[PDB]
Paper text:
The human fibroblast growth factor receptor (FGFR) family of proteins (FGFR1-4) contain an extracellular domain, a transmembrane domain, and a cytoplasmic kinase domain. The FGFR family has critical roles in development and tissue repair through the initiation of multiple signaling cascades controlling proliferation, migration and survival. The FGFR signal pathway is activated through FGF binding to the extracellular domain of FGFR, resulting in dimerization of FGFR molecules. Aberrant FGFR4 signaling pathways, resulting from gene mutation, amplification or overexpression, play an important role in the proliferation, survival and metastasis of a variety of cancer cells.
In this study, we have determined the crystal structure of the FGFR4 kinase domain bound to LY2874455 at a resolution of 2.35 Å. The electron density of LY2874455 is well-defined in the crystal structure except for the ethanol group, which appears to be flexible even in the protein-bound state. Part of the activation loop (amino acids 634–650, not included in the coordinates of the final model) exhibits no electron density, indicating that this region is flexible. In the FGFR4/LY2874455 complex, LY2874455 only occupies the ATP-binding site, and does not induce any conformational changes, which indicates that LY2874455 is a Type I inhibitor for FGFR4. Apparently, upon LY2874455 binding, the FGFR4 kinase domain was kept in DFG-in conformation. LY2874455 binds to the ATP pocket of FGFR4 through extensive interactions. It is orientated such that the indazolyl ring points toward the N-terminal part of the Hinge region, and the dichloropyridinyl ring points toward the C-terminal part of the Hinge region, while the ethanol group points outward from the FGFR4 ATP-binding pocket. The indazolyl ring forms two hydrogen bonds with residues in the N-terminal Hinge region, one with the main-chain carbonyl group of glutamic acid (Glu551) and the other with the main-chain amide of alanine (Ala553). The dichloropyridinyl ring forms a hydrogen bond with the side chain of asparagine (Asn557) in the C-terminal Hinge region. Moreover, LY2874455 in the ATP-binding pocket adopts a chair-like conformation that folds up on the hydrophobic residue Leu619 in the C-lobe making five hydrophobic contacts, and exhibiting remarkable shape and chemical complementarities between the small molecular drug and the kinase protein. In particular, key LY2874455-binding residues of FGFR4, such as Glu551, Ala553, Asn557 and Leu619, are all conserved in FGFR1-3, suggesting that the binding mode of LY2874455 to FGFR1-4 may be conserved in FGFR1-3.
Residue numbers in the entry: 453 to 507, 511 to 570, 583 to 633, 651 to 750
Write the structure that this text describes.
Amino acid sequence: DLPLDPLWEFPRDRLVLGKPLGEGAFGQVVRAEAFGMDPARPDQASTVAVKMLKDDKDLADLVSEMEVMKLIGRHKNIINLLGVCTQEGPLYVIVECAAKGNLREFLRARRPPGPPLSFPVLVSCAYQVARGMQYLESRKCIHRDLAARNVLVTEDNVMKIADFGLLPVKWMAPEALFDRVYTHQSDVWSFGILLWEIFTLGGSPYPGIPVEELFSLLREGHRMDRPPHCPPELYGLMRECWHAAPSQRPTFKQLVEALDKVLLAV
Ligand SMILES: C[C@@H](Oc1ccc2[nH]nc(/C=C/c3cnn(CCO)c3)c2c1)c1c(Cl)cncc1Cl
């Protein structure tokens, strides 16, 4: 419908859509080839992802997400906005393409037969996700859902948090699960769960426990055990994230600093 933004408007003519990528609630995402995305070289073709409506009240969320992405600006560890097609019919939101898919699938696809994903790589994944979450928090933005399937992997193993904005019960903090309140510290609880997903190479949280009585065990002070071959330093981080009192869990800065110290152990 309305405005035309000269910092972001990109012509349909140099966008040829490709094969779908997935989901997601807000609309289908499709691979696409864009021409001249870097106006330095207007030849330099590149692979981008395009978010569209399916065909709506989702038009409101789609425009809303686009405007949010403009506000936050770039960062290494989020899916960044590249341009928008508002001018000749259907809305297109062009964002960067993570070639290796989501992090849980990246992990599961390279699992041993039992007992590549060396220890620096997995620490590198956790460090990058912590850096992206700290940045989103610093822009007063947030991403409740945070789970390994919410994280995308580029061709060069850069982690990018998909979507952010200004049911998944095994990732939710107690106060969000029961009091329906969400803060940065409840993200830290979810990041702890994501940490466990990473060092189980894409495992399912609380294996075997159906999605009910989980809450009673959390009230008993129980939490998932240390996964195999996970060093005690990283399990310590996980359990600090799973402290019941929100102010006793670490902030994303402290998680950044602790993970960075683990990366430096080289
Ligand atoms: C619903 C979908 O949203 C997005 C949003 C922005 C994106 N930029 N780039 C990708 C690449 C997705 C992909 C899927 N598979 N592969 C390898 C093989 O094709 C690549 C992508 C996906 C999704 C999916 Cl598709 C997966 N996990 C999380 C989410 Cl949010």
